[PDB]
Design a protein around this ligand. Structure first.
Ligand SMILES: Cc1cc(O)cc(C)c1NS(=O)(=O)c1ccccc1
Length: 196
C-alpha cells in the first residue's frame, strides 16, 4: 500500500539518477529492487520513454558490446515506427531519442539497426539496406554542411545528387527522393540532443 509505493517511487527516482551517473549501475539498481523487469524489451521501453534520463547515458547503454545491451538496442529500434515516413522523417525521430558522438563502432551498430528497421518498415523504398545506411549518413553530413557555418560549402541539390550516384544496387536513387530529402534538411535542420 502507501508506504511501499512511496518508497518505490523515491527508489525509482534514485535509479534514474544512478543511471545518469552510470547506465549499467542504474539498470542494476532498478532490476535488483524490482522496479524494472530484466528483459531486453522492458529495458528498451524504459529507455524509449526516457523519463529523467540523460540522452547521452541512453546512448552509452545502447552502445555497449555485451549480449544484453545488443538485445536492448535491437528492441529499442523496434519501438520506432517508421512505416510511411521518409528517410529524413525517420532519422529525426531516431536521432532525437539518444546521443553518442565519436564512437565509430557503436554508431555503426546503431545506424545499421536503424537502416534495417527503416527498410523493414518501408520495403518499397530501398531494395538494399546498404543504400539506406549510406544515404542516412549522407543526410547527416548534408545537415552539417548546410547548417554549420564552419563548413564553407553549402552543397547544392545537384552536388548532393552527384555524391550519391550508383548506390542504388549500382543504379541511382530517384532524383525526386533525393530532392525531397535535401529540401527537408534545407528547410529544417536536425534537432540534435545537446550534450547531457
Ligand atoms: C546525428 C548527430 C549529428 C551531429 O551533427 C552531431 C551529433 C552529436 C549527432 N548525434 S550522434 O550521436 O553523434 C550521431 C548519431 C548517429 C549518427 C551519427 C552521429
Amino acid at each position: 500500500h502507501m508506504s511501499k509505493t512511496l518508497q518505490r517511487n523515491r527508489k525509482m527516482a534514485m535509479g534514474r539518477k544512478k543511471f545518469n551517473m552510470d547506465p549499467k549501475k542504474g539498470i542494476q539498481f532498478l532490476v535488483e529492487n524490482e522496479l524494472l523487469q530484466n528483459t531486453p524489451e522492458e529495458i528498451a521501453r524504459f529507455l524509449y520513454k526516457g523519463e529523467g534520463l540523460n540522452k547521452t547515458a541512453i546512448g552509452d547503454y545502447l552502445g555497449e558490446r555485451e549480449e544484453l545491451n545488443l538485445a536492448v538496442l535491437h528492441a529499442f529500434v523496434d519501438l520506432h515506427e517508421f512505416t510511411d515516413l521518409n528517410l529524413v522523417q525517420a532519422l529525426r525521430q531516431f536521432l532525437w531519442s539518444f546521443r553518442l558522438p565519436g564512437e565509430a563502432q557503436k554508431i555503426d551498430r546503431m545506424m545499421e539497426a536503424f537502416a534495417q528497421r527503416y527498410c523493414l518498415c518501408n520495403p518499397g523504398v530501398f531494395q538494399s539496406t546498404d543504400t539506406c545506411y549510406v544515404l542516412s549518413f549522407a543526410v547527416i553530413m548534408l545537415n552539417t554542411s548546410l547548417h554549420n557555418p564552419n563548413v564553407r560549402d553549402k552543397p547544392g541539390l545537384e552536388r548532393f545528387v552527384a555524391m550519391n550516384r550508383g548506390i542504388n544496387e549500382g543504379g541511382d536513387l530517384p532524383e525526386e527522393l533525393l530532392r525531397n530529402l535535401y529540401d527537408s534538411i534545407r528547410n529544417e535542420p536536425f534537432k540534435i540532443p545537446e550534450d547531457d
